[PDB]
Ligand SMILES: Nc1ncnc2c1ncn2[C@@H]1O[C@H](COP(=O)(O)OP(=O)(O)CP(=O)(O)O)[C@@H](O)[C@H]1O
């Protein structure tokens with residue numbers, strides 16, 4: 671049965687505001703030799719095509735180990751940093767898959783508080799995998815929804831706002847609301863004052879305005895059909911969700 675000695679450390683992939691992550695290799699059968707991402711430290715075991723998979727979970731005194739998929743494709747922030755902005759084609763694909771994974775987490779009563787390009791990883795194929803979720807009861811200020819800035823609540827709706835921020839950042843290379851310091855940024859989010867860059871298609875602009883509604887109740891995704899509201903938006907017209915789910919759609923970018 672399970673034990674940290676069953677995994678040899680290869681490299682310290684990194685560390686966040688909630689632990690450290692290592693690239694490990696299991697030395698015990700039946701998956702001996704297999705590479706995994708080990709995190710050392712709230713529902714953590716989710717099964718979905720676009721949500722990172724938890725393979726093992728054990729507690730070594732003082733800390734809890736989490737063995738997850740090792741995603742080789744890096745993160746969206748890193749790729750954004752290099753490309754400075756994605757084409758709408760690429761954005762539509764990444765956001766479509768994120769929509770499915772996000773809606774699924776929601777069904778499980780999970781709020782994706784830390785939604786941002788940094789937490790969206792790509793596998794060797796190019797399909798995304800959401801990571802660092804699991805919070806049911808609760809960061810990067812630029813991605814905070816207005817009801818969250820004003821501590822007026824934090825529901826599934828807040829995730830759709832953040833989803834809109836991610837779309838804007840991937841399409842323009844810039845954040846929609848940002849000031850000189852955290853305080854100015856929070857104040858800018860509250861006004862929900864937004865200039866639409868002119869190179870954005872009318873479909874993209876429409877989806878963005880629907881997502882950036884100050885009131886969580888009028889924001890796209892706030893029922894009745896919930897997530898279906900967004901999946902049925904004209905921006906995703908050319909998207910076949912069935913095949914997307916089956917990872918049938920060929921990703922724009924490959925690593
Ligand atoms: N399953 C996985 N496969 C490959 N890399 C992973 C991974 N889980 C995390 N990482 C990577 O590990 C390093 C740090 O992850 P980490 O979760 O601590 O911070 P982050 O950059 O993702 C900020 P945050 O703390 O907000 O999540 C990052 O380079 C991240 O891309």
Ligand SMILES: [Mg+2]
Pocket residue numbers: 686788789801802
């Ligand atoms: Mg992460």
